[PDB]
Amino acid sequence: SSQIRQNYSTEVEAAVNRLVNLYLRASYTYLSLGFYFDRDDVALEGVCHFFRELAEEKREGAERLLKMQNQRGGRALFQDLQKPSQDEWGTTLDAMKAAIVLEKSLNQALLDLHGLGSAQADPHLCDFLESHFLDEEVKLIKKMGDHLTNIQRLVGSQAGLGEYLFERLTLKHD
Amino acid sequence: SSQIRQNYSTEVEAAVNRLVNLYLRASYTYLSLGFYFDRDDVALEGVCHFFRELAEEKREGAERLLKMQNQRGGRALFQDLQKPSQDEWGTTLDAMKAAIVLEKSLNQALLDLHGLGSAQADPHLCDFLESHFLDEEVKLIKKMGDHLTNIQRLVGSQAGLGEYLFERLTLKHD
Amino acid sequence: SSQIRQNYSTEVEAAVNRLVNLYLRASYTYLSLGFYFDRDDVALEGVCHFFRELAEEKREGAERLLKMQNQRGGRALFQDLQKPSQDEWGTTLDAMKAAIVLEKSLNQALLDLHGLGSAQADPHLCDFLESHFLDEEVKLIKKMGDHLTNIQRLVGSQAGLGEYLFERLTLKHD
Amino acid sequence: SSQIRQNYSTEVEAAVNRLVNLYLRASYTYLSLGFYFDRDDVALEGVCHFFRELAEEKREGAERLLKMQNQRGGRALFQDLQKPSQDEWGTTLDAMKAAIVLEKSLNQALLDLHGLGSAQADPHLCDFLESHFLDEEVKLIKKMGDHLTNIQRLVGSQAGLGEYLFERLTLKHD
Amino acid sequence: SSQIRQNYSTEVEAAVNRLVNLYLRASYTYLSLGFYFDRDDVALEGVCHFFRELAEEKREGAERLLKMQNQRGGRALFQDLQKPSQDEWGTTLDAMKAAIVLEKSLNQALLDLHGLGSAQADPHLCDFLESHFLDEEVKLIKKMGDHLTNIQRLVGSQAGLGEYLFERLTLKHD
Amino acid sequence: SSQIRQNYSTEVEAAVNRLVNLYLRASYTYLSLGFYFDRDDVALEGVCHFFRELAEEKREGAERLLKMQNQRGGRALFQDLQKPSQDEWGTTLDAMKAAIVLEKSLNQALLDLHGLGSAQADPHLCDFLESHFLDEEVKLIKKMGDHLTNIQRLVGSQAGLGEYLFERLTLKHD
Ligand SMILES: [Cl-]
Ligand SMILES: [Cl-]
Ligand SMILES: [Cl-]
Ligand SMILES: [Cl-]
Ligand SMILES: [Cl-]
Ligand SMILES: [Cl-]
């Protein structure tokens, strides 16, 4: 048995490993989104940078989960990582809609794990998610919702113009 | 009787308390405007910041009036504060039109109080309003009129595009 | 429906709007307390500053609640703000007793909302209150209790002397 | 009755006082461990420093609990402090095993108190433990487990050599 | 036998261990005094700080004794630590009277140990106490006597006023 | 057809996408290695850091390949990422042997792609690999070979001692 493990259920341990997989999948999705917007026939630098940043953030979230797994005396177990859902991501609007779908799925997984921890009377797990994940996710979903609204406002009858302007005047670029 | 009060009519004292109520009402209106533009389904940061700044300015004007009330030996009396006139504020154009209506109402209240002070031969009151309120109000109404003209110019046949551009290129944002 | 809202009950949304009203009411109460102690016939600068600071703190708490409402995809709704319970606040002891009553009422509203969030399995709400409100309130009530004890000790048979000394030697002034 | 106490059960108040006793006992245990490794016939400076640091940490945890007791309006009550379980602590391996036993006992007491607070709907207590105790304890137990593994690896057939090397190359010394 | 011990009697070794117990008891007494004055219904910050400082000083004196025990080749032996004599400490005057009683008891224990060392022709022990304990104790008792006189002068017919003033104008606070 | 693509074969484009998969697989392998050495029952910090660094390096190599794919007008295509070959990695010696196997496989894939580029008369591809991959790989394999030799020298009859010493005195740790 583990020399450090205390109040750490096998159910939580397994769910943490699954969440790691979900975060690494999300990271991979964002890597694909980023490089799609770097295509010479797409060429929206700010959009590329937005999603490349998120790929790093999701990687870092998986790493924090893995650190916590070891701090509690659980055992990291890695599974195959499925490829992203699409090879080409459409417009900035299509991409941002796919991103918010993805983030809502991660948020629900966090809420589910928090509920398991609550049920198992695992306050360290619950605190961990509250401190490092739940508000980060709320903030990000709010940002994406703000972006969706602005993108939608800019479609008008001149979609190309709007998509350029959003990239130039809202998103961060060199 | 008051140990300091001199040349300070009961009519002015009452009118100052009413003006405090008007300024705090205005502050509350601007708080509502600000948070409406922060909604994820509205998402115009520069517009939000514009009105949040005005909520602070109107609060500060009420505080200056209350300080003056005490300096003259009058007695602050607070009344209930009515909620703003709307729960949702429409477009940036609708909001800026509502703001200029509100500011003209505050301006007329200032002019009325100045007239009362003149009639009562209360030069300290008249000076106070001239020094800290009348030109501030003229300047703000001119700014709002400038904004209205630019907003109106941008409606064209592409309202969403215009409303984005005004927020991005005229109003202050991060 | 809202594009960002997730795990955010209508009951919590409503209770957040009510709490905003309670905090803005509290802010208004403290504004009145502050200006009462600035009266030339009251003239306790440190007491004035103490309550003016609290008016700002309560305003800021309402603003944080409104920011959170929007981050979750709820809708701010403002109601009329009732005037404070008194026009004149008596002695520093009377005022500090009224303040602790007010703070206990805010604390109970926070605890009630935390309980609703717990019941609704809304950990982001619960975390939010824990992180930004509950300990701030405990700390403030402890400070007020400390002040009450010192004020009470100083009444003796020389109330005016004691009230001066407390203002001069405990409360912050210029 | 207490002027500040609110939502603070007699059960929590008592359990906090018991936990203070447990932390001060732990501090005393670590003081004994530290001075044992400073003996001229033991002479493992890094081990001495490790346990002297923990004696301070446990003292500080008791002080934080006592501060919180007063912030909530409970009453500190002190009991006799039992002497540590041993007068001589054996090898570094024996000592580190005793330390992890002790830390698991403190951790379980924290988890028990968190559970009481949950049952009593005392979110300030629960937050307090989450914010200042639970993760600190997880981190420390993980560190001790890491140390145990390294100590165990170094026993081999040359225990004295291994115990020197661990002290020199893992633990902090002058 | 000990490899370093020289001219260090078993009687001195035992008496040093007893003195450690007395100093740790004193430290614990001062911890209790400090937290009593932090109660919201007592609320004398300067008094709290005075006794919390002494709790640290007495802890440090025990640590210096334990260091010396090991430097001489004696063996630290710890005993149970009795709880302080009171749970509630009365007025600042009551507390300062209890403190000077406690310090006179520590002083007599130091003088007794110095006498034992003299009798045993143990000049290192005698020097140690002279250099690090005897004058520190004389200085502290003189300070406490000075405080008692000032506290007593301030009782008059207005005890609460006097106790506030002493805390504010003699003792160190934030 | 692509507006920028020139002298970029479909065979190279496909092989670049496969190499991206190989590098991301390698990154994932190193993530698993790193977290295995962070286990409380393994606890070799320098070994953990060594492999976590390599996980980042391999991620960065995949990113450089994807950037190049777009610069040439090829299309990134992502595939599922298989999980690492082991869940537990044995000793530092076992791990370093697995790492050099992995690196030789990456090196051969680089050499194969260089050969394809040579055959296709694609000097930009050949230069790219020479400039950013081939020498980096040679250097890393030499480092790993150096480490293997030192690890092997340290096994002796005291494997645990040797594995500690290598981690402490060759690998970088805090
Ligand atoms: Cl798939
Ligand atoms: Cl109304
Ligand atoms: Cl009312
Ligand atoms: Cl015992
Ligand atoms: Cl006793
Ligand atoms: Cl596989």
Angle at CA A62, nearest 5°, toward A58 and A64? 110
Q: Which residues on neighbouring strands pair with residue A81, listed in sequence order?
A: F81
> Which chains neighbour F (Cβ–Cβ under 8 Å, 3 or more pairs)?
A, D
Nearest to B39 among C35, C63, C70 (CB): C70
* 3+ Cβ–Cβ pairs closer than 8 Å linking B and D: no
What is the C-alpha separation between B27 and B16, in angstroms, rounded? 16
SS (H, E, C) chain E: CCCCCCCCCHHHHHHHHHHHHHHHHHHHHHHHHHHHHCCCCCCCHHHHHHHHHHHHHHHHHHHHHHHHHHHHCCCCCCCCECCCCCCCCCCHHHHHHHHHHHHHHHHHHHHHHHHHHHHCCCHHHHHHHHHHHHHHHHHHHHHHHHHHHHHHHHHCCCHHHHHHHHHHHCCCCC
**Is F36 in contact with F50 (CB distance < 8 Å)?**
no
Q: Distance from C40 to chain D by nearest Cα, in Å?
A: 31
**Is E152 in contact with E144 (CB distance < 8 Å)?**
no
Question: Chain E residue with minimal CA distance to D4?
Answer: E40
CA-CA distances (angstroms) from residue F89 to F28, F51, F98?
14, 12, 8
Could you give phi then psi for residue F90, rounded to 5 degrees? Answer: 75, -140
Task: Give chain C's contact residues with B (Cβ, < 8 Å).
Answer: 2-4, 24, 28, 31-32, 35-36, 38-41, 59, 63, 66-67, 69-70, 73, 75-84, 87
- Work out how many CB contacts closer than 8 A connect C with E: 41
Indicate which ligand has the atom closest to the C-alpha of E25.
Answer: 5
Is E56 among the annotated ligand-binding positions? yes
> Which chains neighbour E (Cβ–Cβ under 8 Å, 3 or more pairs)?
C, D
**Is C68 in contact with C16 (CB distance < 8 Å)?**
yes
What is the C-alpha separation between B126 and B118, in angstroms, rounded? 7
**Closest by alpha carbon to C76, among B41, A101, B57, B49?**
B41
Q: Distance from D147 to chain E by nearest Cα, in Å?
A: 26
Nearest to D138 among A71, A121, A126 (CB): A71
Residue C64 is encoded by which pair of tokens?
Answer: 């944080």
Neighbours of ion ligand 3 (CB under 5 A): C 82
What is the C-alpha separation between C134 and C81, in angstroms, rounded? 24
* 3+ Cβ–Cβ pairs closer than 8 Å linking E and C: yes
Task: Provide the residue type at C155 as one letter.
Answer: V
Long-range contacts of B165-169 (CB under 8 A, 24+ apart): B165/A165, B166/B92, B167/B44, B167/B45, B167/B46, B167/B47, B167/B92, B168/A169, B168/A170, B168/B46, B169/A169
What is the C-alpha separation between E86 and D75, in angstroms, rounded? 13
To one decimal, the resolution in angstroms is 1.5
Per domain, the residue ranges of chain C are 10-170
Could you give phi then psi for residue A81, rounded to 5 degrees? Answer: -110, 115
**Is C65 in contact with C15 (CB distance < 8 Å)?**
no
Task: Provide the residue type at A20 as one letter.
Answer: V
What is the C-alpha separation between D168 and D45, in angstroms, rounded? 9
SS (H, E, C) chain A: CCCCCCCCCHHHHHHHHHHHHHHHHHHHHHHHHHHHHCCCCCCCHHHHHHHHHHHHHHHHHHHHHHHHHHHHCCCCCCCCECCCCCCCCCCHHHHHHHHHHHHHHHHHHHHHHHHHHHHCCCHHHHHHHHHHHHHHHHHHHHHHHHHHHHHHHHHCCCHHHHHHHHHHHCCCCC
**CB pair distance less than 8 Å for B35 and C3:** no
Q: Distance from F58 to chain D by nearest Cα, in Å?
A: 28
Q: Can you state the angle between helices C135-155 and C159-169, rounded to 10 degrees? A: 140
Indicate which ligand has the atom closest to the C-alpha of D78.
Answer: 5
What is the C-alpha separation between D127 and D113, in angstroms, rounded? 12
Chain D residues touching F166 at Cβ < 8 A: none
Cα(E108) to centroid(ligand 4), Å: 28
Rg (CA), chain B: 18
Nearest to D66 among E35, E66, E77 (CB): E35
Please name the fold of domain F10-170.
Ferritin (1.20.1260)
Which of C96, C107, C137, C141 to mutate to test binding with chain D, by most D CBs within 10 Å of its CB? C141
What is the C-alpha separation between C39 and A60, in angstroms, rounded? 57
Provide the 10 A C-beta neighbour count for residue D6. Answer: 16
Task: Give chain B's contact residues with C (Cβ, < 8 Å).
Answer: 2-4, 24, 28, 31-32, 35-36, 38-41, 59, 63, 66-67, 69-70, 73, 75-84, 87
Cα(F99) to centroid(ligand 6), Å: 17
What is the three-class DSSP state of C160?
A: helix
Task: Give chain F's contact residues with D (Cβ, < 8 Å).
Answer: 40-43, 45, 157-158, 160-161, 163-165, 168-169
What is the C-alpha separation between B54 and B102, in angstroms, rounded? 12
**Is A34 in contact with A45 (CB distance < 8 Å)?**
no
Q: How far is CA C120 from the centre of its chain?
A: 26
Instruction: Identify the DSSP state of A87.
Output: S
What is the C-alpha separation between F22 and B61, in angstroms, rounded? 66
Nearest to E80 among D4, D63, D81 (CB): D81
What is the C-alpha separation between E157 and E163, in angstroms, rounded? 12
What is the C-alpha separation between C3 and A149, in angstroms, rounded? 9
Q: Distance from D50 to chain F by nearest Cα, in Å?
A: 16
Task: Provide the residue type at C17 as one letter.
Answer: N
What is the C-alpha separation between B152 and B129, in angstroms, rounded? 33
Residue E63 is encoded by which pair of tokens?
Answer: 């640590």
- Work out how many CB contacts closer than 8 A connect D with F: 41
**CB pair distance less than 8 Å for A3 and F41:** yes
Which residue has 């308390």 as its token pair? Answer: B17
Cα(D90) to centroid(ligand 4), Å: 19
Angle at CA A18, nearest 5°, toward A15 and A19? 85
SS (H, E, C) C98-136: HHHHHHHHHHHHHHHHHHHHHHCCCHHHHHHHHHHHHHH
Question: Chain D residue with minimal CA distance to A124?
Answer: D134
**CB pair distance less than 8 Å for C28 and B4:** no
Cα(C85) to centroid(ligand 3), Å: 7
Indicate which ligand has the atom closest to the C-alpha of C25.
Answer: 3
- Work out how many CB contacts closer than 8 A connect A with C: 44
Residue E48 is encoded by which pair of tokens?
Answer: 């709290």
What b/e readout covers A11-45, taking b as 16+ CB neighbours within 10 angstroms?
ebbebbbebbbbbbbbbbbbbbbbbbbbbeebebe
**Closest by alpha carbon to F164, among F51, F49, F35, F44?**
F44
Cα(E16) to centroid(ligand 4), Å: 20
**CB pair distance less than 8 Å for A71 and D145:** no
Task: Give chain C's contact residues with E (Cβ, < 8 Å).
Answer: 142, 145-150, 152-158, 161-162, 165-166, 169-170
> Which chains neighbour D (Cβ–Cβ under 8 Å, 3 or more pairs)?
A, C, E, F
**Is E162 in contact with E170 (CB distance < 8 Å)?**
no
Could you give phi then psi for residue D42, rounded to 5 degrees? Answer: -125, -65
Cα(E143) to centroid(ligand 5), Å: 28
Cα(E84) to centroid(ligand 5), Å: 7
Cα(B84) to centroid(ligand 2), Å: 7
**Is F53 in contact with F61 (CB distance < 8 Å)?**
no
* Structure determination method: X-ray
Nearest to B41 among A149, A157, A158 (CB): A149
Cα(D158) to centroid(ligand 1), Å: 53
CA-CA distances (angstroms) from residue D55 to D25, D35, E154?
10, 11, 41
Which of C2, C3, C8, C122 to mutate to test binding with chain A, by most A CBs within 10 Å of its CB? C3
Which of B37, B44, B154, B161 to mutate to test binding with chain A, by most A CBs within 10 Å of its CB? B161
Could you give phi then psi for residue A6, rounded to 5 degrees? Answer: -160, 125
Provide the 10 A C-beta neighbour count for residue B92. Answer: 25
Nearest to C123 among A114, A145, A148 (CB): A114
Residue D143 is encoded by which pair of tokens?
Answer: 């560190």
Q: Distance from F21 to chain D by nearest Cα, in Å?
A: 35
* 3+ Cβ–Cβ pairs closer than 8 Å linking C and F: no
Q: Which residues on neighbouring strands pair with residue D81, listed in sequence order?
A: E81
Q: Distance from A15 to chain C by nearest Cα, in Å?
A: 18
What is the C-alpha separation between F39 and B53, in angstroms, rounded? 52
